């Protein structure tokens, strides 16, 4: 009769944990399609929005993890506008699409600490963002990361375009201290939020051993 499907839209800069968190969630929930802008050729005729809608055509798909930074408000505007315009090419009128913002940069986080956490993650642990995956020029890494931060516009659901989100999940971002890693905390935040608010997506919280193992795999993942 009627189906609701979801597009999880991150708002992040480089090294905030976006790919790690989405890889963890896909490890846990293989039916949640993880579409990585970083892996799409720029001559490809199917761009991330096209692949998103193709994925949502499948009856077995309920969630697309839309893996792109979307640090600028114009980038969020593009998702809403393009998906809204193109969905009729792909989906019948019994499918309701909901957009879930996954906010990776807390309002309370200073730009200095955003830089401190993310730049040192990228240099110490690596990042597969294509323009910086080599890191043969640490000046280039700094310059690209600064570009995303310069363009970053915090989520604001009291105005266009972010008022089009149906739900926002607020993540944490902090320096690693002892065994604590904010990306694993954030996986749990997402799972708990969906268990409570979207039981159609997670009827029962997975065992903690499995959540932690899926996170370990994502943390260790090299492509
Ligand atoms: O909570 C964390 N603590 C420490 N390092 C992390 C955490 N989450 C991800 N990382 C590491 O940070 C680096 C950047 O990962 P991220 O998921 O931010 O990539 P992204 O820029 O493609 O979204 C990776 O080497 C990853 O393993």
PDB file of C-alpha atoms and ligand atoms in Angstrom:
ATOM      1  CA  UNK A   1       0.000   0.000   0.000  1.00  0.00           C
ATOM      2  CA  UNK A   2       2.322   2.697   1.325  1.00  0.00           C
ATOM      3  CA  UNK A   3       6.068   2.775   1.990  1.00  0.00           C
ATOM      4  CA  UNK A   4       8.357   5.295   3.659  1.00  0.00           C
ATOM      5  CA  UNK A   5      11.995   5.430   2.590  1.00  0.00           C
ATOM      6  CA  UNK A   6      14.859   7.510   3.926  1.00  0.00           C
ATOM      7  CA  UNK A   7      17.871   9.447   2.687  1.00  0.00           C
ATOM      8  CA  UNK A   8      20.441   9.993   5.456  1.00  0.00           C
ATOM      9  CA  UNK A   9      22.206  13.277   4.593  1.00  0.00           C
ATOM     10  CA  UNK A  10      25.433  14.083   6.478  1.00  0.00           C
ATOM     11  CA  UNK A  11      26.549  17.629   7.177  1.00  0.00           C
ATOM     12  CA  UNK A  12      30.293  17.352   7.688  1.00  0.00           C
ATOM     13  CA  UNK A  13      33.709  18.569   6.680  1.00  0.00           C
ATOM     14  CA  UNK A  14      36.639  16.237   5.964  1.00  0.00           C
ATOM     15  CA  UNK A  15      37.608  13.853   8.764  1.00  0.00           C
ATOM     16  CA  UNK A  16      34.512  14.270  10.935  1.00  0.00           C
ATOM     17  CA  UNK A  17      33.815  10.523  10.868  1.00  0.00           C
ATOM     18  CA  UNK A  18      31.203  10.526   8.091  1.00  0.00           C
ATOM     19  CA  UNK A  19      32.581   7.639   6.003  1.00  0.00           C
ATOM     20  CA  UNK A  20      33.505   5.656   9.139  1.00  0.00           C
ATOM     21  CA  UNK A  21      30.035   6.040  10.655  1.00  0.00           C
ATOM     22  CA  UNK A  22      28.223   5.206   7.401  1.00  0.00           C
ATOM     23  CA  UNK A  23      30.497   2.202   6.767  1.00  0.00           C
ATOM     24  CA  UNK A  24      29.697   0.981  10.300  1.00  0.00           C
ATOM     25  CA  UNK A  25      25.965   1.368   9.732  1.00  0.00           C
ATOM     26  CA  UNK A  26      26.148  -0.456   6.398  1.00  0.00           C
ATOM     27  CA  UNK A  27      28.216  -3.218   8.051  1.00  0.00           C
ATOM     28  CA  UNK A  28      25.357  -3.618  10.555  1.00  0.00           C
ATOM     29  CA  UNK A  29      22.518  -3.152   8.059  1.00  0.00           C
ATOM     30  CA  UNK A  30      23.633  -4.423   4.632  1.00  0.00           C
ATOM     31  CA  UNK A  31      20.316  -3.420   3.069  1.00  0.00           C
ATOM     32  CA  UNK A  32      21.071   0.273   3.811  1.00  0.00           C
ATOM     33  CA  UNK A  33      22.742   1.283   0.580  1.00  0.00           C
ATOM     34  CA  UNK A  34      25.942   3.268   1.102  1.00  0.00           C
ATOM     35  CA  UNK A  35      26.553   5.552  -1.896  1.00  0.00           C
ATOM     36  CA  UNK A  36      29.941   7.258  -1.710  1.00  0.00           C
ATOM     37  CA  UNK A  37      30.395  10.413  -3.741  1.00  0.00           C
ATOM     38  CA  UNK A  38      34.149   9.845  -3.390  1.00  0.00           C
ATOM     39  CA  UNK A  39      33.892   6.643  -5.462  1.00  0.00           C
ATOM     40  CA  UNK A  40      31.866   8.111  -8.373  1.00  0.00           C
ATOM     41  CA  UNK A  41      33.824   9.053 -11.491  1.00  0.00           C
ATOM     42  CA  UNK A  42      33.082  12.538 -12.662  1.00  0.00           C
ATOM     43  CA  UNK A  43      32.414  11.318 -16.188  1.00  0.00           C
ATOM     44  CA  UNK A  44      29.872   8.857 -14.745  1.00  0.00           C
ATOM     45  CA  UNK A  45      26.415   9.414 -16.118  1.00  0.00           C
ATOM     46  CA  UNK A  46      24.792   8.172 -12.897  1.00  0.00           C
ATOM     47  CA  UNK A  47      25.645  10.751 -10.219  1.00  0.00           C
ATOM     48  CA  UNK A  48      24.993  10.305  -6.503  1.00  0.00           C
ATOM     49  CA  UNK A  49      21.407  11.573  -6.771  1.00  0.00           C
ATOM     50  CA  UNK A  50      20.633   9.205  -9.662  1.00  0.00           C
ATOM     51  CA  UNK A  51      22.092   6.205  -7.824  1.00  0.00           C
ATOM     52  CA  UNK A  52      20.098   7.227  -4.734  1.00  0.00           C
ATOM     53  CA  UNK A  53      16.816   7.083  -6.599  1.00  0.00           C
ATOM     54  CA  UNK A  54      17.751   3.852  -8.402  1.00  0.00           C
ATOM     55  CA  UNK A  55      18.481   2.281  -5.006  1.00  0.00           C
ATOM     56  CA  UNK A  56      15.119   3.424  -3.623  1.00  0.00           C
ATOM     57  CA  UNK A  57      13.321   1.718  -6.530  1.00  0.00           C
ATOM     58  CA  UNK A  58      14.224  -1.666  -5.039  1.00  0.00           C
ATOM     59  CA  UNK A  59      11.564  -3.019  -2.676  1.00  0.00           C
ATOM     60  CA  UNK A  60      14.315  -4.307  -0.356  1.00  0.00           C
ATOM     61  CA  UNK A  61      15.877  -0.858   0.106  1.00  0.00           C
ATOM     62  CA  UNK A  62      14.519   1.497   2.733  1.00  0.00           C
ATOM     63  CA  UNK A  63      17.596   3.661   3.451  1.00  0.00           C
ATOM     64  CA  UNK A  64      20.266   5.386   1.383  1.00  0.00           C
ATOM     65  CA  UNK A  65      23.371   6.573   3.243  1.00  0.00           C
ATOM     66  CA  UNK A  66      24.114   9.593   1.045  1.00  0.00           C
ATOM     67  CA  UNK A  67      27.860   9.825   1.672  1.00  0.00           C
ATOM     68  CA  UNK A  68      28.948  13.372   0.755  1.00  0.00           C
ATOM     69  CA  UNK A  69      30.127  16.245   2.990  1.00  0.00           C
ATOM     70  CA  UNK A  70      27.327  18.739   2.165  1.00  0.00           C
ATOM     71  CA  UNK A  71      29.164  21.331   4.247  1.00  0.00           C
ATOM     72  CA  UNK A  72      27.651  24.194   2.217  1.00  0.00           C
ATOM     73  CA  UNK A  73      23.951  24.995   2.340  1.00  0.00           C
ATOM     74  CA  UNK A  74      23.922  25.043  -1.491  1.00  0.00           C
ATOM     75  CA  UNK A  75      24.938  21.364  -1.390  1.00  0.00           C
ATOM     76  CA  UNK A  76      21.917  20.500   0.765  1.00  0.00           C
ATOM     77  CA  UNK A  77      19.715  22.582  -1.546  1.00  0.00           C
ATOM     78  CA  UNK A  78      20.988  20.490  -4.483  1.00  0.00           C
ATOM     79  CA  UNK A  79      19.908  17.228  -2.832  1.00  0.00           C
ATOM     80  CA  UNK A  80      16.370  18.375  -2.052  1.00  0.00           C
ATOM     81  CA  UNK A  81      15.876  20.051  -5.433  1.00  0.00           C
ATOM     82  CA  UNK A  82      17.339  17.208  -7.515  1.00  0.00           C
ATOM     83  CA  UNK A  83      15.635  14.361  -5.643  1.00  0.00           C
ATOM     84  CA  UNK A  84      12.283  16.184  -5.609  1.00  0.00           C
ATOM     85  CA  UNK A  85      12.576  16.910  -9.360  1.00  0.00           C
ATOM     86  CA  UNK A  86      13.718  13.435 -10.373  1.00  0.00           C
ATOM     87  CA  UNK A  87      11.839  11.126  -8.022  1.00  0.00           C
ATOM     88  CA  UNK A  88       8.874  10.771 -10.416  1.00  0.00           C
ATOM     89  CA  UNK A  89      11.227   9.238 -12.983  1.00  0.00           C
ATOM     90  CA  UNK A  90      11.813   6.414 -10.506  1.00  0.00           C
ATOM     91  CA  UNK A  91       9.184   6.069  -7.780  1.00  0.00           C
ATOM     92  CA  UNK A  92       5.428   5.703  -7.785  1.00  0.00           C
ATOM     93  CA  UNK A  93       3.178   7.836  -5.605  1.00  0.00           C
ATOM     94  CA  UNK A  94       2.889   5.236  -2.820  1.00  0.00           C
ATOM     95  CA  UNK A  95       6.498   5.882  -1.740  1.00  0.00           C
ATOM     96  CA  UNK A  96       7.075   8.695   0.776  1.00  0.00           C
ATOM     97  CA  UNK A  97      10.647   9.994   1.018  1.00  0.00           C
ATOM     98  CA  UNK A  98      12.009  11.365   4.284  1.00  0.00           C
ATOM     99  CA  UNK A  99      15.295  13.254   4.592  1.00  0.00           C
ATOM    100  CA  UNK A 100      17.244  12.651   7.818  1.00  0.00           C
ATOM    101  CA  UNK A 101      20.074  15.094   8.527  1.00  0.00           C
ATOM    102  CA  UNK A 102      23.065  13.549  10.322  1.00  0.00           C
ATOM    103  CA  UNK A 103      24.843  16.559  11.841  1.00  0.00           C
ATOM    104  CA  UNK A 104      28.537  15.860  12.410  1.00  0.00           C
ATOM    105  CA  UNK A 105      29.650  19.306  13.669  1.00  0.00           C
ATOM    106  CA  UNK A 106      28.064  20.302  17.015  1.00  0.00           C
ATOM    107  CA  UNK A 107      26.954  23.923  17.413  1.00  0.00           C
ATOM    108  CA  UNK A 108      29.118  24.143  20.525  1.00  0.00           C
ATOM    109  CA  UNK A 109      32.338  23.054  18.781  1.00  0.00           C
ATOM    110  CA  UNK A 110      34.836  25.824  18.114  1.00  0.00           C
ATOM    111  CA  UNK A 111      36.432  26.098  14.687  1.00  0.00           C
ATOM    112  CA  UNK A 112      39.818  25.716  16.388  1.00  0.00           C
ATOM    113  CA  UNK A 113      38.822  22.386  17.916  1.00  0.00           C
ATOM    114  CA  UNK A 114      37.080  21.251  14.717  1.00  0.00           C
ATOM    115  CA  UNK A 115      40.410  21.790  12.962  1.00  0.00           C
ATOM    116  CA  UNK A 116      42.402  20.195  15.786  1.00  0.00           C
ATOM    117  CA  UNK A 117      40.317  17.013  15.783  1.00  0.00           C
ATOM    118  CA  UNK A 118      39.867  16.575  12.049  1.00  0.00           C
ATOM    119  CA  UNK A 119      43.244  17.651  10.654  1.00  0.00           C
ATOM    120  CA  UNK A 120      45.112  15.440  13.102  1.00  0.00           C
ATOM    121  CA  UNK A 121      42.826  12.501  12.324  1.00  0.00           C
ATOM    122  CA  UNK A 122      43.519  12.894   8.608  1.00  0.00           C
ATOM    123  CA  UNK A 123      47.290  13.167   8.957  1.00  0.00           C
ATOM    124  CA  UNK A 124      47.632  10.501  11.667  1.00  0.00           C
ATOM    125  CA  UNK A 125      45.127   7.907  10.415  1.00  0.00           C
ATOM    126  CA  UNK A 126      44.527   8.710   6.730  1.00  0.00           C
ATOM    127  CA  UNK A 127      41.551   9.814   4.656  1.00  0.00           C
ATOM    128  CA  UNK A 128      40.417   8.453   1.307  1.00  0.00           C
ATOM    129  CA  UNK A 129      38.962  11.697  -0.038  1.00  0.00           C
ATOM    130  CA  UNK A 130      40.412  11.386  -3.518  1.00  0.00           C
ATOM    131  CA  UNK A 131      42.129  14.773  -3.756  1.00  0.00           C
ATOM    132  CA  UNK A 132      44.037  14.109  -0.508  1.00  0.00           C
ATOM    133  CA  UNK A 133      44.250  10.308  -0.361  1.00  0.00           C
ATOM    134  CA  UNK A 134      47.944  10.360  -1.330  1.00  0.00           C
ATOM    135  CA  UNK A 135      49.003  12.997   1.249  1.00  0.00           C
ATOM    136  CA  UNK A 136      52.274  13.444  -0.641  1.00  0.00           C
ATOM    137  CA  UNK A 137      51.784  17.203  -0.088  1.00  0.00           C
ATOM    138  CA  UNK A 138      50.678  18.007   3.465  1.00  0.00           C
ATOM    139  CA  UNK A 139      50.144  21.582   2.239  1.00  0.00           C
ATOM    140  CA  UNK A 140      47.579  20.280  -0.257  1.00  0.00           C
ATOM    141  CA  UNK A 141      45.764  18.340   2.482  1.00  0.00           C
ATOM    142  CA  UNK A 142      45.582  21.438   4.667  1.00  0.00           C
ATOM    143  CA  UNK A 143      44.414  23.537   1.719  1.00  0.00           C
ATOM    144  CA  UNK A 144      41.640  21.141   0.687  1.00  0.00           C
ATOM    145  CA  UNK A 145      40.447  20.662   4.274  1.00  0.00           C
ATOM    146  CA  UNK A 146      40.391  24.434   4.797  1.00  0.00           C
ATOM    147  CA  UNK A 147      38.259  24.779   1.673  1.00  0.00           C
ATOM    148  CA  UNK A 148      35.505  22.591   3.109  1.00  0.00           C
ATOM    149  CA  UNK A 149      35.666  24.423   6.435  1.00  0.00           C
ATOM    150  CA  UNK A 150      35.537  27.825   4.712  1.00  0.00           C
ATOM    151  CA  UNK A 151      32.403  26.708   2.823  1.00  0.00           C
ATOM    152  CA  UNK A 152      30.809  25.142   5.918  1.00  0.00           C
ATOM    153  CA  UNK A 153      27.402  26.577   6.812  1.00  0.00           C
ATOM    154  CA  UNK A 154      25.829  25.051   9.936  1.00  0.00           C
ATOM    155  CA  UNK A 155      22.465  23.353   9.663  1.00  0.00           C
ATOM    156  CA  UNK A 156      19.577  25.792  10.174  1.00  0.00           C
ATOM    157  CA  UNK A 157      16.142  24.165  10.006  1.00  0.00           C
ATOM    158  CA  UNK A 158      14.394  27.510  10.604  1.00  0.00           C
ATOM    159  CA  UNK A 159      15.043  28.475   6.958  1.00  0.00           C
ATOM    160  CA  UNK A 160      15.626  27.150   3.449  1.00  0.00           C
ATOM    161  CA  UNK A 161      17.059  24.710   2.510  1.00  0.00           C
ATOM    162  CA  UNK A 162      17.517  22.867   5.804  1.00  0.00           C
ATOM    163  CA  UNK A 163      13.876  23.344   6.820  1.00  0.00           C
ATOM    164  CA  UNK A 164      13.160  20.523   4.336  1.00  0.00           C
ATOM    165  CA  UNK A 165      14.707  17.912   6.614  1.00  0.00           C
ATOM    166  CA  UNK A 166      12.161  15.679   8.314  1.00  0.00           C
ATOM    167  CA  UNK A 167      14.434  14.844  11.273  1.00  0.00           C
ATOM    168  CA  UNK A 168      17.900  15.795  12.526  1.00  0.00           C
ATOM    169  CA  UNK A 169      20.274  13.502  14.432  1.00  0.00           C
ATOM    170  CA  UNK A 170      22.833  15.489  16.422  1.00  0.00           C
ATOM    171  CA  UNK A 171      26.241  13.832  16.685  1.00  0.00           C
ATOM    172  CA  UNK A 172      29.209  14.547  18.906  1.00  0.00           C
ATOM    173  CA  UNK A 173      32.755  15.355  17.869  1.00  0.00           C
ATOM    174  CA  UNK A 174      35.636  15.106  20.304  1.00  0.00           C
ATOM    175  CA  UNK A 175      39.304  14.235  20.561  1.00  0.00           C
ATOM    176  CA  UNK A 176      40.062  10.581  21.274  1.00  0.00           C
ATOM    177  CA  UNK A 177      40.557  10.096  25.021  1.00  0.00           C
ATOM    178  CA  UNK A 178      41.438   6.610  26.316  1.00  0.00           C
ATOM    179  CA  UNK A 179      39.174   4.001  24.648  1.00  0.00           C
ATOM    180  CA  UNK A 180      36.525   6.587  23.751  1.00  0.00           C
ATOM    181  CA  UNK A 181      36.042   7.384  20.056  1.00  0.00           C
ATOM    182  CA  UNK A 182      33.311   9.808  19.057  1.00  0.00           C
ATOM    183  CA  UNK A 183      32.562   7.906  15.847  1.00  0.00           C
ATOM    184  CA  UNK A 184      31.528   4.809  17.842  1.00  0.00           C
ATOM    185  CA  UNK A 185      29.550   7.049  20.209  1.00  0.00           C
ATOM    186  CA  UNK A 186      27.846   8.522  17.142  1.00  0.00           C
ATOM    187  CA  UNK A 187      26.937   5.123  15.699  1.00  0.00           C
ATOM    188  CA  UNK A 188      25.214   4.390  19.005  1.00  0.00           C
ATOM    189  CA  UNK A 189      23.504   7.816  18.970  1.00  0.00           C
ATOM    190  CA  UNK A 190      22.127   7.093  15.498  1.00  0.00           C
ATOM    191  CA  UNK A 191      20.997   3.559  16.383  1.00  0.00           C
ATOM    192  CA  UNK A 192      19.328   4.734  19.606  1.00  0.00           C
ATOM    193  CA  UNK A 193      17.580   7.610  17.815  1.00  0.00           C
ATOM    194  CA  UNK A 194      16.204   5.298  15.123  1.00  0.00           C
ATOM    195  CA  UNK A 195      15.202   2.578  17.616  1.00  0.00           C
ATOM    196  CA  UNK A 196      13.103   5.189  19.415  1.00  0.00           C
ATOM    197  CA  UNK A 197      11.776   7.292  16.534  1.00  0.00           C
ATOM    198  CA  UNK A 198      11.844   4.957  13.481  1.00  0.00           C
ATOM    199  CA  UNK A 199      11.190   1.392  14.693  1.00  0.00           C
ATOM    200  CA  UNK A 200      10.440   0.428  11.085  1.00  0.00           C
ATOM    201  CA  UNK A 201      14.201   0.764  10.459  1.00  0.00           C
ATOM    202  CA  UNK A 202      15.579  -0.851  13.646  1.00  0.00           C
ATOM    203  CA  UNK A 203      13.006  -3.043  15.366  1.00  0.00           C
ATOM    204  CA  UNK A 204      15.552  -4.298  17.918  1.00  0.00           C
ATOM    205  CA  UNK A 205      18.922  -2.813  18.833  1.00  0.00           C
ATOM    206  CA  UNK A 206      21.760  -5.078  17.599  1.00  0.00           C
ATOM    207  CA  UNK A 207      24.005  -6.693  20.172  1.00  0.00           C
ATOM    208  CA  UNK A 208      26.735  -4.374  21.417  1.00  0.00           C
ATOM    209  CA  UNK A 209      29.417  -6.925  20.450  1.00  0.00           C
ATOM    210  CA  UNK A 210      28.216  -6.650  16.845  1.00  0.00           C
ATOM    211  CA  UNK A 211      27.958  -2.845  16.809  1.00  0.00           C
ATOM    212  CA  UNK A 212      31.497  -2.578  18.184  1.00  0.00           C
ATOM    213  CA  UNK A 213      32.824  -5.150  15.702  1.00  0.00           C
ATOM    214  CA  UNK A 214      31.176  -3.416  12.758  1.00  0.00           C
ATOM    215  CA  UNK A 215      32.801  -0.181  13.950  1.00  0.00           C
ATOM    216  CA  UNK A 216      36.224  -1.851  14.278  1.00  0.00           C
ATOM    217  CA  UNK A 217      35.949  -3.062  10.682  1.00  0.00           C
ATOM    218  CA  UNK A 218      35.019   0.424   9.487  1.00  0.00           C
ATOM    219  CA  UNK A 219      37.803   2.063  11.506  1.00  0.00           C
ATOM    220  CA  UNK A 220      40.370  -0.367  10.039  1.00  0.00           C
ATOM    221  CA  UNK A 221      38.989  -0.218   6.497  1.00  0.00           C
ATOM    222  CA  UNK A 222      41.338   0.614   3.635  1.00  0.00           C
ATOM    223  CA  UNK A 223      39.934   0.585   0.036  1.00  0.00           C
TER     224      UNK A 223
HETATM  225  O1  LIG B   1      36.178   8.430  16.402  1.00  0.00           O
HETATM  226  C1  LIG B   1      37.267   8.425  15.787  1.00  0.00           C
HETATM  227  N1  LIG B   1      38.442   8.592  16.416  1.00  0.00           N
HETATM  228  C2  LIG B   1      39.619   8.597  15.765  1.00  0.00           C
HETATM  229  N2  LIG B   1      39.749   8.454  14.429  1.00  0.00           N
HETATM  230  C3  LIG B   1      38.635   8.269  13.693  1.00  0.00           C
HETATM  231  C4  LIG B   1      37.323   8.241  14.330  1.00  0.00           C
HETATM  232  N3  LIG B   1      36.427   8.052  13.326  1.00  0.00           N
HETATM  233  C5  LIG B   1      37.117   7.966  12.169  1.00  0.00           C
HETATM  234  N4  LIG B   1      38.440   8.074  12.405  1.00  0.00           N
HETATM  235  C6  LIG B   1      39.528   8.073  11.422  1.00  0.00           C
HETATM  236  O2  LIG B   1      39.554   9.373  10.826  1.00  0.00           O
HETATM  237  C7  LIG B   1      39.938   9.282   9.457  1.00  0.00           C
HETATM  238  C8  LIG B   1      38.894   9.997   8.612  1.00  0.00           C
HETATM  239  O3  LIG B   1      37.714   9.202   8.642  1.00  0.00           O
HETATM  240  P1  LIG B   1      36.313   9.836   8.182  1.00  0.00           P
HETATM  241  O4  LIG B   1      35.223   8.825   8.485  1.00  0.00           O
HETATM  242  O5  LIG B   1      36.115  11.197   8.792  1.00  0.00           O
HETATM  243  O6  LIG B   1      36.519   9.995   6.597  1.00  0.00           O
HETATM  244  P2  LIG B   1      35.704  11.039   5.676  1.00  0.00           P
HETATM  245  O7  LIG B   1      36.454  12.349   5.637  1.00  0.00           O
HETATM  246  O8  LIG B   1      35.781  10.344   4.331  1.00  0.00           O
HETATM  247  O9  LIG B   1      34.289  11.197   6.128  1.00  0.00           O
HETATM  248  C9  LIG B   1      40.026   7.796   9.138  1.00  0.00           C
HETATM  249  O10 LIG B   1      41.412   7.409   9.162  1.00  0.00           O
HETATM  250  C10 LIG B   1      39.259   7.132  10.270  1.00  0.00           C
HETATM  251  O11 LIG B   1      39.675   5.794  10.559  1.00  0.00           O
END
